[PDB]
Design a protein around this ligand. Structure first.
Ligand SMILES: CC(=O)N[C@@H](CO)[C@@H](O)[C@H](O)[C@@H](O)COP(=O)(O)O
Ligand SMILES: CC(=O)N[C@@H]1[C@@H](O)[C@H](O)[C@@H](COP(=O)(O)O)O[C@@H]1O
Length: 266
């Protein structure tokens, strides 16, 4: 695994944005051979979305031949609701870039047949072949997407029941009312994520320090699903400073030596 120890959320956003752009440009995608990008929502990726839009506006990237898949979506939330992940993605990314609407893939949280919806999402991914870069965040409890504690490490896209802890955490988007937060979500699986060619996780804040420790210094286990990255051939974690507080000195020391040139940098 690579760990990129930066200082602020701003640096993290610029580092990740720059990584995605370079991956896309080196790939040279066409209509027959699009670049496949997996995307998350939430507080974490904000500075990344900001930086991505800037670089596009500056003419450093085109998303004309980029296909996107989102990780997850709330069940039973109207698509029009501003806190749905559909709304989040358009408001913060799709509205500002040159990506064709046929290239956008999102889970339908109001599908009448949930199993069929989840299965088709997996078929859609397979029809492209592979996701080239999946970007995500990590939960306080270590969840990757909505793969909550005790989710199978070989899971596929399916419905999951949100932990009480996850609902409390997300209630900041539902006017600090836990009761307003949906109980269920449609989510890609751990197996689904492991099938991506490259996985990049953004880690911000001291609230994520235990999760980062579990991911980096902990053992493989299904309580902290983020630990699946230890099994991935090409995983990257991009971190701010307070998120690194729970690591051993020698661990952080190692990654600082490793990445000094790739962050400094600036
Ligand atoms: C609001 C938040 O941080 N809650 C977390 C922790 O359990 C969780 O609900 C999220 O879905 C998780 O992916 C974290 O992403 P963000 O902290 O919103 O960037
Ligand atoms: C000069 C150098 O050390 N290069 C390595 C690279 O080969 C590697 O893959 C990654 C470690 O991750 P890995 O052990 O999971 O492949 O770190 C570095 O970027």
């Amino acid at each position: 695994m690579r760990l990129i120890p930066l200082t602020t959320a701003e640096q993290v956003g610029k580092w990740a944005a720059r990584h995605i752009v370079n991956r896309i440009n080196a790939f040279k995608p066409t209509a027959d051979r699009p670049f496949v990008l997996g995307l998350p929502t939430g507080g974490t990726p904000m500075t990344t979305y900001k930086a991505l839009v800037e670089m596009h506006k500056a003419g450093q990237v085109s998303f004309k031949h980029v296909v996107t898949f989102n990780m997850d979506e709330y069940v039973g939330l109207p698509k029009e609701h501003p806190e749905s992940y559909y709304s989040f993605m358009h408001r913060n990314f799709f509205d500002h870039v040159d990506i064709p609407a046929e290239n956008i893939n999102l889970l339908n949280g109001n599908a009448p047949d949930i199993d069929a919806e989840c299965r088709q999402y997996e078929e859609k991914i397979r029809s492209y072949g592979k996701i080239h870069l999946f970007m995500g965040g990590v939960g306080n409890d270590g969840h990757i997407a909505f793969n909550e504690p005790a989710s199978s490490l070989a899971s596929r896209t399916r419905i999951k029941t949100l932990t009480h802890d996850t609902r409390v955490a997300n209630s900041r988007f539902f006017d600090n009312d836990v009761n307003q937060v949906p109980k269920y979500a449609l989510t890609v699986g751990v197996g689904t994520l492991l099938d991506a060619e490259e996985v990049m996780i953004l880690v911000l804040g001291s609230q994520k320090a235990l999760a980062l420790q579990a991911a980096v210094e902990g053992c493989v286990n299904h309580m902290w699903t983020i630990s699946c990255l230890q099994l991935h051939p090409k995983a990257i974690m991009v971190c701010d400073e307070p998120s690194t507080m729970e690591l051993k000195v020698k661990t952080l020391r190692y990654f600082n030596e490793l990445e000094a040139e790739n962050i400094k940098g600036l």
